[PDB]
Amino acid sequence: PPKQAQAIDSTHECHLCGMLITEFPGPKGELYTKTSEKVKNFCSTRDLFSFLLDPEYVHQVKEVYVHDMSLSPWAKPNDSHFINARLAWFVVGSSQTGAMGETIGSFSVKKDAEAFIEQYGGKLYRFDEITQAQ
Numbered sequence: 001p002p003k004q005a006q007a008i009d010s011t012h013e014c015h016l017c018g019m020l021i022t023e024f025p026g027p028k029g030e031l032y033t034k035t036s037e038k039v040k041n042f043c044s045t046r047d048l049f050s051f052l053l054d055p056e057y058v059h060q061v062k063e064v065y066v067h068d069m070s071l072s073p074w075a076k077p078n079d080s081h082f083i084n085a086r087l088a089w090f091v092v093g094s095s096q097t098g099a100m101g102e103t104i105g106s107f108s109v110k111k112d113a114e115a116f117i118e119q120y121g122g123k124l125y126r127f128d129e130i131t132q133a134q
């Protein structure tokens, strides 16, 4: 039984960097580790990937969720539309920023990610192709 994404409220702080999450724009992230039933919330897809690619945690991470920017506006992502990050399309290197500056756009629809790149630049990636280089 997969653990489910949860709403992010105004008091939630990023698991990596401690900043308040919902003040800032850009897709946010959540994930669970095998060891804890409490979801870990992140201020940005940037910090989500930084955490889950860290060798200390890479094997502990099970469920990973990101806002679907096919459905939610960039400035105010909506917690009703979390998608499975492992099946999403990602845009790295666009001009659009999140809570930590540069960030990773996340979409359910490949053509939406491609149109995003047409507008704002960047490159298209699947979950597995995102490494510590990016």
Ligand SMILES: [Cu+]
Pocket (backbone or CB within 6 Å): 014, 017, 018, 019, 043, 099, 100
């Ligand atoms: Cu931050």
Ligand SMILES: [Zn+2]
Pocket (backbone or CB within 6 Å): 014, 015, 016, 017, 018, 019, 042, 043, 044, 047, 100
């Ligand atoms: Zn953060």
